[PDB]
Amino acid sequence: LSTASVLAFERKLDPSDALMSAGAWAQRDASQEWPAVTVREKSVRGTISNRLKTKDRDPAKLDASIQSPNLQTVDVANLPSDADTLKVRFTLRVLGGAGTPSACNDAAYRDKLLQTVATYVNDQGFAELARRYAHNLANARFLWRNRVGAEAVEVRINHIRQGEVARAWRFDALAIGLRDFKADAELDALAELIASGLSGSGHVLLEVVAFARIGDGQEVFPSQELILDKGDKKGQKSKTLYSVRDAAAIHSQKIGNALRTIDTWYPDEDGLGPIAVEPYGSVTSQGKAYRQPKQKLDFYTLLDNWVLRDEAPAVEQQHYVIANLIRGGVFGE
C-alpha cells in the first residue's frame, strides 16, 4: 500500500476571534455591557540601537545618525484609566469525527487510516488529549502576553446546549499550572465533555470568558497585522493591530495555537516544557525546529510507519499523531 497523493483534514477545536473589553474587578459578574478596547494611534521618535557593522563605528557617523530623525507612528491599545481588568470572550465548536479525511485519492489508504484511528479509539479514548485541551482552556494560554505579569486571572467556561446555558465552570488560571498536567473534578468533567465531543457522540458548543486584573491604563496586546512598508508617500504607520468594528481583537488562530500546546515528547528535553502540536514541530519564535525528520519522531514518519507498515509507536507518539489529525493540515505530496 502507498499513501495517497492528496490528503486533507478539516480542523476540530475551531475557535472564533476574541473580543477584548475593559472594566472593573469585582464587577465581572455583570459584564455583558463593558465597552470594547479601541486601537488608538501615537507617534514615536526612535533611536540608534541596532548593532553597528563596525565599518561605520566612526564619531561623525554616529553623530549624524543621532541628529537624524527616526519618527514613526504606531498603534497602541490601552485600558481606560478607571478600568483595571480585561474581558476576553470567544466561542469554540468541538466537531468530532477526527479520523476521516476530507479529501483522499486512494480508497485503500482511506480505509486503512479509518481502522487505524478506530483501533486507536478502541485501545483508548480521547481522554488524555481532552484532558490536555481542558488544561489549556483552564489556564489562560490564549492570554499570551496579557497573562504575563497579572494580579489574578479567572476563566469562565459555559456549555451551550440551546439558547440557554446547560453546564458551567469557574477556574483559577494562576493556581492551575502552566508547566504540567494535573487532575481535578471540574477539569475531568470538562475533559469528558470535550472527549464526548471529539468522538462524534454529541454536539459541544463552549464559550470561554477570561478576566485578567492588570492595572489602570496598562497596555493590552491585540494581535499584530502584517503590513508591507514599501515606498509610498512619506511613510505610513509601521505597526498595525488587528481589530473588528470598534473593538480590538485577537485572531482565532492565535487562540487555536494556544489550545494545542500539548507536546512534551519532542526528543530534546523536558527542561523547556510543552510546545505546540505541529508537523516538524517547530517553535519558530525561538528559531529552532524540534522533532527534526533526521530522528524517527517526525509526524510523517510515524504516520507512514503506523498506517502502511502497521508498526505501532509508543502511546505518547500515538497521542501526538492523533493531535496532529485533530489539528488539520495539508498532508500528502
Binding site: 502584517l226 508591507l228 512598508d229 514599501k230 515606498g231 509601521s238
Partner: protein
C-alpha cells in the same frame, strides 16, 4: 555545483523567498518556492558586499523590501 549559503530574509512571504548560492567566484540569487524548489527567476552577482549595497539600496523596509526584490528579479531582464 551551487552551494547554498543563506536565505535573504528572516521570514518567507508566500512560501516564496530568495535563496543565495555560491556559483564559482560569482554568487547567485534565486527566487524560489521553498517547499518544492521551483525557481521563477534568478540574477547573477559577484560580491556579497555589492549585493548587500544593492539590496539595502532598494526602497522599503523588511518584507516590503524583499517584495520589491522579488518583483525586480521576477521580471525578465531587458536585452
Amino acid at each position: 555545483s551551487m552551494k547554498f549559503i543563506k536565505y535573504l530574509s528572516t521570514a518567507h512571504l508566500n512560501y516564496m523567498n530568495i535563496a543565495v548560492y555560491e556559483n564559482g567566484s560569482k554568487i547567485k540569487a534565486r527566487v524560489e518556492n521553498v517547499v518544492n524548489g521551483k525557481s521563477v527567476g534568478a540574477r547573477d552577482f559577484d560580491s556579497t558586499e555589492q549585493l548587500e549595497s544593492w539590496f539595502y539600496g532598494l526602497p522599503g523596509s523588511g518584507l516590503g523590501r524583499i517584495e520589491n526584490a522579488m518583483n525586480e528579479i521576477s521580471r525578465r531582464e531587458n536585452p
